[PDB]
């Protein structure tokens, strides 16, 4: 009786939200950006190839200096690269080799990683002893660690396969806030530029916008037909793009609270693993299962170019803070740095 | 390059030297994925042979590393990509429980037909055979109630039952095994094979059965690259 009545009210609320989004869907992003000229053909060359990983690379993250990057592979090795020279700055042996994510702290003093061991391990890069040591192991998730991102040297946000995200106090080792509401494994998260909000994509084909300080879900974004694997905020923080296993990328707007554009092609039938934006946000770069990285025009939904330099799955990618280059990691155990030429 | 850059580049080459040494140790060790249900008893086999539970048992100076991804739920379509290059999958079922056999058959079919497990052989264990023998000997419950095709099943002439085994026990035991093998032969095209076995909760020969099965998996790998198969 009471349960049946309540679940009927949820359907009424869902229709109210759907009607509200349809009311403000006066135009389409495609119609708005029809007049502007296309970006043309985007040609990028492999400037660097980072060799040394002996297994599938699962994650990479640029440092804020746009020169150092950290990559994670399932050979149980965290490697920090000097991308300008391809020099290896550090090689961190992982206690558990089943790593799924890695993060570089914005200060550059710490890196984080974690995988099927359900632990987010914090590594101190600046020690008087001259070696990288584990500073914290964040326990509390009951599923695998899928993504992690530093807010500062003391705070980090993790998404897990136990359907929850958590905000951690690194110094005390306790999760101050737990973000619940996903009905599937959360596969990715992206931080807003001001680090006051973050979006997460799960295997329930939905993306939720979370308030870091308040600790609740502000908005829920649906429209994908399969698990969401990747998510990335737009550079101004008012939008984000997702990538799913249904071979599509979608651009959702926070303030309009709805999808704005779909990035799919008839030839593309493979899942998407990673998404990122260029510094101006005009380009959306997506990694695919078909060994390629497709550069999309974010405004016009046109495939601007292709990064074809890997012989296995493109598992991860990232664009530098200065926008100078894009790194692609792959299951072929290589990292490649791309940019164009005049 | 400056003096400090040459020193930095030398440090990088010393890092590469240690990375190569670590990659040589990983080639000698065989990785196994231990899958099964709660009632399967997969925790018993590993204990006798001895987040993520990792076990290392050595047979004839050969190192086996077995992993059990405990917890979570039946939604394992995500982390199964990690074990795309394991030597074998050790799938354990409970033959005594006829009620949940169809779930095991459905579970085994998903693993066999998984996109990321198209080249991984499966070392199938049908655990708790002593319990199954007692259950068949008691005769209180009949397999034909759950599987109608068991009434029209006859033991193949090629079967070689162990001495001291009741023919009724053999007929039921070989019917459960054929259900899993029928799934394996449906697809695969010879890329991966299933190695069914019958074990018990007190069996001490489980480590060698994996050893003999992993030898066939490695041997098939070597013959393919020599173009001998």
């Amino acid at each position, epitope marked *: 009786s009471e349960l049946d009545q309540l679940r009927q009210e949820a359907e009424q609320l869902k229709n109210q939200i759907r009607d509200a989004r349809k009311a403000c869907a006066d135009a389409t992003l495609s119609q708005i950006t029809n007049n502007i000229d296309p970006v043309g053909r985007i040609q990028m060359r492999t400037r660097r190839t980072l060799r040394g990983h002996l297994a599938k690379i699962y994650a990479m993250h640029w440092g804020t200096d746009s020169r150092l990057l950290v990559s994670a592979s399932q050979d149980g090795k965290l490697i920090i690269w000097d991308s300008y020279t391809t020099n290896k*700055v*550090h090689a961190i042996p992982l206690r558990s080799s089943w790593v799924m994510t890695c993060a570089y702290a914005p200060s550059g003093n710490y890196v984080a990683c974690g995988g099927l061991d359900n632990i987010c391990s914090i590594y101190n890069l600046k020690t008087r002893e*001259g*070696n990288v040591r584990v500073s914290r192991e964040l326990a509390g998730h009951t599923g695998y660690l899928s993504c992690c991102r530093f807010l500062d040297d003391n705070q980090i946000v993790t998404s897990s396969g136990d359907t929850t995200c958590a905000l951690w106090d690194i110094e005390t080792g306790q999760q101050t806030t737990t973000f619940t509401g996903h009905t599937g494994d959360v596969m990715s998260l992206s931080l807003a530029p001001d680090t006051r909000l973050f979006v997460s994509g799960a295997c329930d084909a939905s993306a939720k916008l979370w308030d870091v300080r308040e600790g609740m879900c502000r908005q829920t974004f649906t429209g994908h037909e399969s698990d969401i694997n990747a998510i990335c905020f737009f550079p101004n923080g008012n939008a984000f793009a997702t990538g799913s296993d249904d071979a599509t990328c979608r651009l959702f707007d926070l303030r309009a609270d709805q999808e704005l554009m779909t990035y799919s092609h008839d030839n593309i039938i493979c899942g998407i693993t990673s998404v990122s934006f260029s510094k101006s946000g005009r380009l959306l770069l997506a990694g695919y299962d078909d060994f390629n990285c497709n550069v999309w025009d974010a405004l016009k939904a046109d495939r601007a170019g292709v990064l074809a330099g890997h012989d296995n799955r493109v598992s991860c990618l990232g664009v530098t803070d200065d926008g100078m280059a894009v790194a692609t990691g792959s299951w072929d155990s290589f990292l490649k740095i791309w940019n164009g030429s005049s | 390059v*400056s*003096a400090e850059d040459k020193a930095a580049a030398e*440090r990088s080459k010393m890092i590469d030297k240690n990375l190569r040494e670590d990659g040589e140790k990983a080639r000698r060790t065989l990785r196994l994925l231990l899958l099964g249900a709660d009632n399967s008893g997969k925790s018993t086999i590993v204990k006798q042979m001895r987040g993520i539970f990792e076990t290392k048992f050595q047979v004839d100076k050969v190192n086996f590393h077995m992993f059990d991804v405990g917890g979570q739920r039946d939604e394992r379509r995500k982390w199964i990509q990690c074990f795309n290059d394991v030597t074998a999958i050790i799938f354990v079922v409970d033959s005594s429980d006829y009620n949940r056999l169809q779930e095991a058959l459905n579970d085994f079919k998903s693993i066999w037909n998984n996109r990321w497990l198209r080249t991984i052989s499966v070392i199938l264990f049908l655990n708790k055979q002593d319990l199954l023998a007692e259950k068949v000997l008691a005769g209180k419950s009949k397999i034909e109630d759950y599987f109608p095709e068991f009434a029209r099943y006859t033991t193949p002439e090629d079967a070689t039952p162990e001495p001291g085994e009741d023919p009724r026990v053999t007929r039921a035991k070989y019917f459960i095994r054929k259900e899993f093998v029928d799934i394996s032969t449906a697809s695969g095209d010879g890329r991966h094979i299933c190695y069914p076995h019958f074990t018990c909760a007190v069996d001490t020969e489980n480590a060698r059965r994996i050893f003999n099965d992993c030898k066939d998996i490695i041997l098939q790998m070597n013959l393919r690259e020599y173009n001998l198969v």
Partner: single-chain antibody, 231 residues
Framework: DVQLVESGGGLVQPGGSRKLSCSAS????????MHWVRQAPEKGLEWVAY????????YYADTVKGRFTISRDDPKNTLFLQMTSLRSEDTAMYYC??????????????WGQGTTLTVSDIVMTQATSSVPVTPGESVSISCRSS???????????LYWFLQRPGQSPQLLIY???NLASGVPDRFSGSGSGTAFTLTISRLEAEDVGVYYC?????????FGAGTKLEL
């Protein structure tokens, strides 16, 4: 804590041989390159030798090349300096210096206490030998180089050290602008090309000492004469 203890020094006859040892504790010794730096009595610092991490690269100063041999024992965390045919020019305090080299590292960050031995090229110039100072007042120290220390990679390989009376040198500024760990923010390094300045805002009693500028653009590493601060 990080420690570097030198031993084996003492009075030796001319033409003799002596073995200096540097025991390291509290840090990953095998990860650090090591230098020997000596300082003649009432004189400035002079770099002697260098052995890299992994013992693959070894450099010597010309005044000691062929007579000194530098070696390390990574399992025992001991640094050695075998000296032969010792001359009266070798009478100095020999310092054991650790230095690690990667992008953003701080070489020459820790020095040993030193051991005293008594026997019976880019030019770095510090023309101002001494500077009278008063507490709380800003002081600037100038250093000059015959060659430009700015490399094509953007680094300017200039280092600043402070040797308080009775103490081993301590790193203040590495690569001409970066502030070493544990150094107050009042120290600031500014330079361009061949001219460099070390600015000390709000000078204190602890800042009193001799300041050395060292170049790390190429070997042999050379030090300036040194500028002394007195109250």
């Amino acid at each position: 804590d990080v420690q570097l203890v030198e031993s084996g020094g003492g009075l030796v006859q001319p033409g003799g041989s002596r073995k200096l040892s540097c025991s390291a504790s509290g840090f990953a010794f095998s990860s650090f390159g090591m230098h020997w730096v000596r300082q003649a009595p009432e004189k400035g610092l002079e770099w002697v030798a260098y052995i890299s991490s992994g013992s693959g690269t070894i450099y010597y100063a010309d005044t000691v090349k062929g007579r000194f041999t530098i070696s390390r024992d990574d399992p025992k965390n001991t640094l050695f300096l075998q000296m032969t045919s010792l001359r009266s020019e070798d009478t100095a305090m020999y310092y054991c210096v650790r230095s690690i080299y990667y992008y953003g590292s701080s070489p020459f960050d820790f020095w040993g206490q030193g051991t005293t031995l008594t026997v019976s090229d880019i030019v770095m110039t510090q023309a101002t030998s001494s500077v009278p100072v008063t507490p709380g007042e800003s002081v600037s120290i100038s250093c000059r180089s015959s060659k430009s220390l700015l490399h094509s990679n953007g680094n300017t390989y200039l280092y600043w050290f402070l040797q308080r009376p009775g103490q081993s040198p301590q790193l203040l500024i590495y690569r001409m602008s970066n502030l070493a760990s544990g150094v107050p923010d009042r120290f600031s390094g500014s330079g361009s090309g061949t001219a460099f300045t070390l600015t000390i805002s709000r000078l204190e009693a602890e800042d009193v000492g001799v300041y050395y500028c060292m170049q790390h653009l190429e070997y042999p590493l050379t030090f300036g004469a040194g500028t002394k601060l007195e109250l």
